[PDB]
Design a protein around this ligand. Structure first.
Ligand SMILES: CCC(CC)O[C@@H]1C=C(C(=O)O)C[C@H](N)[C@H]1NC(C)=O
Length: 659
């Protein structure tokens, strides 16, 4: 299948290029595919990559274009003046602007299919949107089309939406090309920055909450939430997926599901993005969410995640019960049998389920992955799948029989419907993992677990203490071990307001650590301890970041090399009061007195481009790896988008900007 027109290397500065002679009447069916490899020399304003129009005055709403905005949104219009049919299809955060001071080359495409009555948009290997419209228009449906141009739309004799940049290659086809074809054609160097992709080996269309960590053997490791029913935190099905690199982040393993329940199938789901439909949720599968990684001094790796029973969000999680009982000085996870009102059972030694009323073993036991057995045989339940037919969400039993599990809605014995924290360990730097262990009720029997601050933990150098950041919604909760992870305690620090206090740690000098965290006041807070985390100061606030009240998670790490002769920390965060945008990487230099000179910053892409959760690591060659949400993960307008969590790399030289 060959283009009706191909052009190369067309450099424009808002003025466009007439190609009317080389396109006139060549769209026989009226359908089209246009594939554009381009880079922008300026991001400002609404810019059309091409425009097919009726250019006569009074016909200025008769055109087809593909456009870009300054926030990375890719869109198309198909309009006809006389019928007053005005189609607009787009998806936020579809393209990249700049990377390390240079214009990024993207490849985008539009497909208009008359048989399906859909418009499709592709960017850098991804089909970002396909939308069926009632009032469909192809080129033949638009009346008096007489003008075909590159880099703008001709409206009433004037060039509108002038493009600034270079069209490196543009191809016009006069039919609708298939999805696989256009995905290949738009595949480029940007595509390689996506470690997790829609319907890869995780089976998930959506991801959020990336984490990076570099292990002592040189391996660069990531984890992430695989979110199946859109990007909702709740209700949903979420797994923790992982992937790693042994060549300094150049190539990554195919993602694996590492923490995953199977009450619901890990399937690719087409979650609706329309107003209203986008609030749709699955009824809730048992879920792991918000992972935290740390390497122990003995080189063992721990990964933590929040664990939620099926149907339980942060909103309905009981605040007044840990899910544990104390019996003869032991903390046992407690269970309610279907039909009982009280929790009459505990999981004790070897997983044996005891009736606490008679204090004897029952026929039941629970394995180390929470699966239920009776007299040594597994009980099962039927797994759910979710589908769309074609309003129209349905959930159904799908034929698969899975082990019955205490975290499932269909279990005979159920845990308290609240949140827990689990961890798994690896002695082979992430190739294989243990069974999960739930943290003991560190907050007390009559309180639920805290929520993890996604990112890393640290090991404080002077004492060897392991520190894992978490929060309750009213307090910081710094989870810690003084015995190489054999036991766990917690320091609870009341906060001045109800912060979603996702935090990360840095060590400024031996014994001295800071917890940088999200607030509900627009600022990044940091609290300081000078006794290795045993006591904490009142909060102070960074002066140069100003965000919305909801806040965003941040990443901060210690860096191993001197910068300007000083020890350095590296911070990544959005910085904008208008949304989760204007991603910045800041370099802070530690002064002799343990204050920090925030001397450099690098804007990650243009300032109106999306930037939400982030994670930094120091690569073994001392470059910096960053994985981040390249969209606004708070905005209702940016929910449920595919392939928006890229990995990129910086030399320190790239970051030492702006002073
Ligand atoms: C709205 C705050 C609330 C914490 C209580 O949600 C957090 C916010 C998030 C967010 O603002 O994007 C994502 C976190 N994964 C989520 N944590 C949990 C446990 O659901």
């Amino acid at each position: 299948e060959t283009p009706v027109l191909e052009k190369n290397n067309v450099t424009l500065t808002g003025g466009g290029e007439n190609v009317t002679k080389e396109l006139k009447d060549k769209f026989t069916s009226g359908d089209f595919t246009v594939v554009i490899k381009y880079n922008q020399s300026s991001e400002k304003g609404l810019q059309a990559l091409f425009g097919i129009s009726n250019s006569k005055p009074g016909q200025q709403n008769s055109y087809v274009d593909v456009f870009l905005r300054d926030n990375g949104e890719l869109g198309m219009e198909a309009r006809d003046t006389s019928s007053n049919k005005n189609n607009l299809v787009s998806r936020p955060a579809s393209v990249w602007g700049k990377y390390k001071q240079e214009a990024v080359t993207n490849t985008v495409a539009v497909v208009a299919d008359s048989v399906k009555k859909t418009y499709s948009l592709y960017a850098n290997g991804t089909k970002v949107v396909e939308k069926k419209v009632d009032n469909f228009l192809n080129i033949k449906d638009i009346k008096g089309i007489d003008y075909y141009m590159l880099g703008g739309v001709k409206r009433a004799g004037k060039t509108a939406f002038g493009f600034n940049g270079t069209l490196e290659n543009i191809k016009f086809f006069n039919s609708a090309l298939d999805e696989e074809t256009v995905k290949k054609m738009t595949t480029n160097a940007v595509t390689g920055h996506l470690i997790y992709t829609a319907n890869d080996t995780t089976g998930s269309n959506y991801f959020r909450i990336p984490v990076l960590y570099t292990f002592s053997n040189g391996r660069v490791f990531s984890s992430i939430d695989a979110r199946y029913g859109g990007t909702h935190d709740f209700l949903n099905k979420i797994n923790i997926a992982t992937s790693y690199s042994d060549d300094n982040g150049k190539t990554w393993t195919k993602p694996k599901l590492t923490l995953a329940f199977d009450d619901f199938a890990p399937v690719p789901l087409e979650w609706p993005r329309e107003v209203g439909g986008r609030d749709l949720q699955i009824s809730g599968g048992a879920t792991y969410i918000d992972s935290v990684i740390v390497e122990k001094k003995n080189k063992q790796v721990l990964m933590f995640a929040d664990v939620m029973p099926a149907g339980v969000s942060f909103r309905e999680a009981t605040r007044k019960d840990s899910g544990y009982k104390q019996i003869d000085g032991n903390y046992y996870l407690k269970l309610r049998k279907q039909g009982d009102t009280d929790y009459n059972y505990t999981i004790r030694e070897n997983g044996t389920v005891y009736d606490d009323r008679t204090n004897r073993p029952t026929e039941f036991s629970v394995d180390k992955n929470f699966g239920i057995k009776q007299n040594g045989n597994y009980l099962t339940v039927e797994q759910y799948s979710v589908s769309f037919e074609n309003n129209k969400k349905t959930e159904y039993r799908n034929g698969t029989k899975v082990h019955m599990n205490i975290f499932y809605k269909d279990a005979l014995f159920k845990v308290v419907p609240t949140n827990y924290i689990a961890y798994i360990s690896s002695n082979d730097h992430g190739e294989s993992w243990s069974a999960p262990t739930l943290l003991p009720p560190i907050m007390g029997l009559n309180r639920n677990a805290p929520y993890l601050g996604p990112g890393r933990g640290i090991i404080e150098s002077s004492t060897g203490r392991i520190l894992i950041p978490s929060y309750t919604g009213k307090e910081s909760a710094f989870i810690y071990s003084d015995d190489n992870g054999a036991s766990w305690k917690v320091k609870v620090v009341p906060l001045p307001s109800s912060w979603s206090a996702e935090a990360q740690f840095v060590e400024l000098s031996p014994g001295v650590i800071q917890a940088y965290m999200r607030t509900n006041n627009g600022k990044i807070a940091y609290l300081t301890s000078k006794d290795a985390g045993t006591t904490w100061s009142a909060p102070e606030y960074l002066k140069f970041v100003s965000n919305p009240s909801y806040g965003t998670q941040l990443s901060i790490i210690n860096y191993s090399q001197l910068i300007d002769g000083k020890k350095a920390v590296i911070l990544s965060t959005p910085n904008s009061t208008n949304g989760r945008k204007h991603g910045q990487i800041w370099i802070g230099l530690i002064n002799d007195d343990n204050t920090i000179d925030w001397r450099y910053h690098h804007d990650v892409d243009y300032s109106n481009y999306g930037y939400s959760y982030s994670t930094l690591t120091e690569l073994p060659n001392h470059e910096i790896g960053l994985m981040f949400e390249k969209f606004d993960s708070w905005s209702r307008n940016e929910l449920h988008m595919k392939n928006v969590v890229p990995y990129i790399t910086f030399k320190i030289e790239d970051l030492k900007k702006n002073l």
